Design a protein around this ligand. Structure first.
Ligand SMILES: CC(C)(COP(=O)(O)OP(=O)(O)OC[C@H]1O[C@@H](n2cnc3c(N)ncnc32)[C@H](O)[C@@H]1OP(=O)(O)O)[C@@H](O)C(=O)NCCC(=O)NCCS
Ligand SMILES: CC(C)(COP(=O)(O)OP(=O)(O)OC[C@H]1O[C@@H](n2cnc3c(N)ncnc32)[C@H](O)[C@@H]1OP(=O)(O)O)[C@@H](O)C(=O)NCCC(=O)NCCS
Lengths: 152, 151
């Protein structure tokens, strides 16, 4: 395997755009991830922010997977946690340890940031158990309730 | 009536009071207050533009509180507000306070381009008021939560 797990820099908005296409195909929601892409300026400032983390997995120059996460600096104590928002690997490239490699990279990035934990919500439907099997091996599962409150 | 407003960088002595309010709603007056950050640290956090701290007052004192994070999305120029903790003092429970905190967050989320506010709710019997409050302002979905150690 020639896998390269790479943290996107502010100098790599172009890579972020391709990663969005990887997310779209993997989530079967191309319209959401590529239908109204941000401007380079917006994407750039996000990449040079203190809390946003974008990882890309590459094979011979091709993006085959990636991860988007947010570092949450806490208020009750001097500590931080990393929230994995999106994580995806291209279909032809799955069951090969790419997602594991991405999370392993996020761990060593987290330890360098002083974060004490990484957490991620797993959807529960039929499409999910590959991710659930992935998350169950790395962390501790707990069943919670999620609510989407609308904003006008 | 009620007074819900956002905390400011030079309201750290009030944030630290809100930290205590969390400690009694949650019954863990040691995680939220047994190891509080430096005075220096907490203003840095309040001066940040993605962290949102809300305190509900009635008569010049804390009854409710909210701590949230604005998540600027990468796929589109939009934002999502993640409520991390929402708490109301027990003495003043069931008076529409938690509702007023979320309504305030809606108005500020709109001024940030936020299209949704999401919040997690566990399942323990003590948390049925939260689940009830949340189930009427948003549609529920049952998900799995995973805590992965950085170790
Ligand atoms: C979930 C996903 C990222 C996993 O990618 P991946 O690179 O294939 O995962 P890995 O190869 O590292 O697999 C790691 C372990 O997780 C388990 N696992 C992964 N996929 C599995 C599957 N379909 N079925 C059962 N177990 C699975 C296995 O234990 C695997 O280890 P193993 O091959 O040694 O048995 C990929 O399936 C995907 O992109 N799905 C679509 C989007 C999605 O669900 N994202 C999650 C958002 S949180
Ligand atoms: C959940 C909590 C914040 C609600 O606070 P609140 O100010 O009392 O709630 P509100 O007054 O605004 O209630 C609004 C609606 O929510 C529902 N609700 C609130 N509490 C309820 C309860 N014990 N039982 C049933 N429904 C309840 C009702 O529909 C209520 O409207 P109503 O009184 O007119 O019938 C509060 O109970 C609390 O702090 N609990 C402890 C901590 C917690 O669970 N936090 C959430 C996770 S961070």
């Amino acid at each position: 395997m020639s896998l390269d797990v790479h943290q996107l820099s502010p100098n790599e908005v172009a890579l972020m755009e391709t990663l969005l296409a990887t997310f779209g195909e993997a989530f079967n929601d191309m319209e959401t991830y590529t239908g109204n892409r941000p401007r380079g300026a917006y994407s750039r400032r996000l990449l040079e922010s203190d809390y946003f983390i974008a990882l890309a997995a590459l094979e011979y120059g091709e993006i085959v997977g990636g991860l988007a996460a947010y570092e949450l600096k806490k208020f009750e104590q001097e500590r931080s946690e990393i929230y994995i928002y999106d994580l995806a690997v291209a279909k032809a490239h799955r069951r090969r340890g790419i997602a594991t490699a991405l999370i392993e990279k996020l761990k060593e990035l987290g330890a360098a940031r002083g974060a004490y934990v990484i957490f991620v919500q797993a959807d529960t439907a039929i499409e999910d158990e590959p991710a659930i099997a992935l998350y169950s091996k790395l962390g501790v599962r707990e069943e919670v309730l999620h609510f989407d409150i609308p904003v006008s």
